[PDB]
Amino acid sequence: KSLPSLVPLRIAALNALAACNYLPQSREKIIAALFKALNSTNSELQEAGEACMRKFLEGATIEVDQIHTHMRPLLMMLGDYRSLTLNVVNRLTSVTRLFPNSFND
């Protein structure tokens, strides 16, 4: 209740989640949590949100299905131009910078 921002606590939690890559059974969940943070509207969380995902991928791997399912909301607002914004475009470039093969022509 006394945290000015509460962001620093969230940031470090992802890193603890990311370091848990070596456990396979956990991957099904921590992957989902990372992606939700990866899409977090908070830009500072977004920056570390994708950075932690990179650390997780070093000790694990990600397929198209999880990307497609997790990033599904991102593809929803792709119909209308005005849906994109300062951070949404940042999220788009952030997601493609890793596992780039997800997106195509």
**Resolution to 1 decimal, in Å?**
3.4
Rounded to a whole number of angstroms, the CA Rg of the chain reads 14
What technique was this entry resolved by?
cryo-EM
What are φ and ψ of residue 103, in 5° steps? -100, 155
CA distance 12 to 15: 5
Other Cβ atoms less than 10 A from the Cβ of 95: the count is 21
CA gap 67, 28 in Å, rounded? 12
Cβ-in-10-Å burial (0-12, 13-18, 19+) of 73 comes to exposed
Contact 28, 54 (CB under 8 A): no
Report d(CA 15, CA 68) in Å as an integer.
Answer: 23
Do 34 and 53 form a contact (C-beta atoms < 8 A)?
yes
